[PDB]
Amino acid sequence: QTIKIGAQSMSESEIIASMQGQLIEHHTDLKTTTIKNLGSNAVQQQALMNGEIDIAATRYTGDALTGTLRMEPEKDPDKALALTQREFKKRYDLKWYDSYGFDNTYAFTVSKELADQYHLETVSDVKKWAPQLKLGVDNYWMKLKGNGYQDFTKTYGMTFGGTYPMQIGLVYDAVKSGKMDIVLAYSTDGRIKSYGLKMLKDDKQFFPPYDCSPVVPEKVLKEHPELEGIIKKMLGKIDTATMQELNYEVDGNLKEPSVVAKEYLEKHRYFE
């Protein structure tokens, strides 16, 4: 105490951070606080190693494997998760837990209308139309090194009419309003379904798995043996469809992540 729980700048990260916090406080005498607006993955990793945070609420296997670990790329979600867990324990004395039950992947996304008009189901379907299209992307994907824009341009070999970086939160309205024709969205965003959008299949498997787990140093788990059993209550409980809905409560309906987390915990009676 106090258990410091870290969140990056994503609704789901704040929701999940609040969930664990409230859960910990529901079941034990531990106090918690949330550290929000954490930056890049390297920044988040550094916070975990020095003590700025005691629990990382949301980490994604794909980011850890290619970014933090710099490992041989792995296409299979279960093998990627197992490798990530063993290397985090061996290199960093960190426990990467099993997944909450959801993955949050980059996903090329269009309106249902434009999908019908251009006959789009897969990312390769976009290839022949690309020179006429405007693509909106987040603020870091253009310069991202492993599975960023450069490597996309080599693997799929299409070049867009224009490329437009912006706060990820804005891409959903950008494509829905027709200001962008296609966007690299995040798959857990509830605005995809609610705005009548459609995710295109990554037929080449350019993107690695991105299953989401909490991460805690073995030091912290030793000093607070009650922590393990509480975190375990959340594992496998939140699938992608469910995370999308929780996200929409924040992004679309403007509710506080803490309120959304509480209402979810109340529904599930705090997992006993």
mmCIF file with all atom_site columns, C-alpha atoms in Angstrom, residues 19 22-23 26 258-272:
data_model
loop_
_atom_site.group_PDB
_atom_site.id
_atom_site.type_symbol
_atom_site.label_atom_id
_atom_site.label_alt_id
_atom_site.label_comp_id
_atom_site.label_asym_id
_atom_site.label_entity_id
_atom_site.label_seq_id
_atom_site.pdbx_PDB_ins_code
_atom_site.Cartn_x
_atom_site.Cartn_y
_atom_site.Cartn_z
_atom_site.occupancy
_atom_site.B_iso_or_equiv
_atom_site.pdbx_formal_charge
_atom_site.auth_seq_id
_atom_site.auth_comp_id
_atom_site.auth_asym_id
_atom_site.auth_atom_id
_atom_site.pdbx_PDB_model_num
ATOM 1  C CA . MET A 1 19  ? -11.879 -2.373  -12.160 1.00 0.00 ? 19  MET A CA 1
ATOM 2  C CA . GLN A 1 22  ? -12.183 -1.392  -7.001  1.00 0.00 ? 22  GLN A CA 1
ATOM 3  C CA . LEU A 1 23  ? -11.885 -5.185  -6.960  1.00 0.00 ? 23  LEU A CA 1
ATOM 4  C CA . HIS A 1 26  ? -13.633 -4.704  -2.403  1.00 0.00 ? 26  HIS A CA 1
ATOM 5  C CA . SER A 1 258 ? -14.751 4.410   -12.776 1.00 0.00 ? 258 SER A CA 1
ATOM 6  C CA . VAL A 1 259 ? -18.584 4.410   -13.106 1.00 0.00 ? 259 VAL A CA 1
ATOM 7  C CA . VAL A 1 260 ? -18.454 1.904   -15.962 1.00 0.00 ? 260 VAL A CA 1
ATOM 8  C CA . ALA A 1 261 ? -16.094 -0.347  -13.990 1.00 0.00 ? 261 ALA A CA 1
ATOM 9  C CA . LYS A 1 262 ? -18.312 -0.153  -10.903 1.00 0.00 ? 262 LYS A CA 1
ATOM 10 C CA . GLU A 1 263 ? -21.492 -0.965  -12.793 1.00 0.00 ? 263 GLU A CA 1
ATOM 11 C CA . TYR A 1 264 ? -19.727 -3.966  -14.370 1.00 0.00 ? 264 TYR A CA 1
ATOM 12 C CA . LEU A 1 265 ? -18.451 -5.214  -10.999 1.00 0.00 ? 265 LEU A CA 1
ATOM 13 C CA . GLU A 1 266 ? -21.907 -4.797  -9.457  1.00 0.00 ? 266 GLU A CA 1
ATOM 14 C CA . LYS A 1 267 ? -23.422 -6.845  -12.284 1.00 0.00 ? 267 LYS A CA 1
ATOM 15 C CA . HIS A 1 268 ? -20.943 -9.635  -11.614 1.00 0.00 ? 268 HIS A CA 1
ATOM 16 C CA . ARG A 1 269 ? -21.198 -9.267  -7.799  1.00 0.00 ? 269 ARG A CA 1
ATOM 17 C CA . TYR A 1 270 ? -17.468 -8.503  -7.555  1.00 0.00 ? 270 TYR A CA 1
ATOM 18 C CA . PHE A 1 271 ? -16.765 -12.071 -8.668  1.00 0.00 ? 271 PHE A CA 1
ATOM 19 C CA . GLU A 1 272 ? -18.058 -13.506 -5.358  1.00 0.00 ? 272 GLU A CA 1
#
